[PDB]
């Protein structure tokens, strides 16, 4: 079996973009901060800890638009007890057609890899957006790299990436551009 079911019909003809969570769209920590966009309770061995989450700038603009252009899929090496609530709060527009977490990654050479082969899509019509090149080692030609984000409220990288994505959204074969 594959990780995703068939694309639902309005998505059939779209490129499938796999999008990472931490350091890509948000940055989270257990260290209290005052300006967290979200605070999430996470239970670890019977103790409830608080996770403070900051939104990367332009994340809302970015997701709303990607959600129109692609079949967007959340794929993260983090556990659902963290990632799933954050996606609930982050994803106002329903951009994410599916969510995959740590158990859907492949553990390989000490790293949790996003094995794009396991989605069940044509890789000529798959992209991955992930801040950590280790996450896509099996498919480095499917990637749009993006810098790691932590707290720079000046970051404009998700904004500045939209034009590139618009123009990818049109093509038949993503490799025709990334090679």
């Amino acid at each position: 079996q594959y990780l995703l079911p068939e694309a639902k019909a309005q998505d059939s003809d779209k490129i499938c973009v796999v999008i990472n969570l931490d350091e890509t769209l948000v940055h989270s920590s257990f260290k209290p901060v005052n300006n967290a966009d979200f605070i999430i309770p996470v239970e670890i061995d019977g103790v409830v800890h608080q996770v403070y989450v900051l939104k990367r700038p332009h994340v809302d603009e970015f997701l709303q638009r990607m959600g129109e252009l692609f079949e967007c899929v959340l794929f993260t090496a983090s556990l659902a007890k963290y990632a799933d609530p954050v996606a609930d709060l982050l994803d106002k527009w329903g951009a994410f057609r599916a969510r995959l977490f740590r158990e859907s990654c492949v553990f390989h050479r000490g790293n949790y890899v996003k094995d794009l082969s396991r989605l069940g899509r044509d890789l000529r019509r798959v992209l991955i957006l992930d801040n950590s090149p280790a996450s896509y080692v099996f498919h480095p030609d499917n990637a749009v790299p993006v810098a790691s984000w932590f707290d720079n409220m000046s970051d404009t990288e998700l904004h500045d990436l939209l034009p590139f994505f618009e123009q990818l959204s049109r093509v038949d074969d993503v490799y025709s551009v990334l090679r």
Binding site: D22, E23, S28, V42, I44, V51, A77, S78, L79, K81, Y82
Partner: peptide
């Protein structure tokens, strides 16, 4: 860590 439950994150990354």
């Amino acid at each position: 860590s439950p994150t990354x």
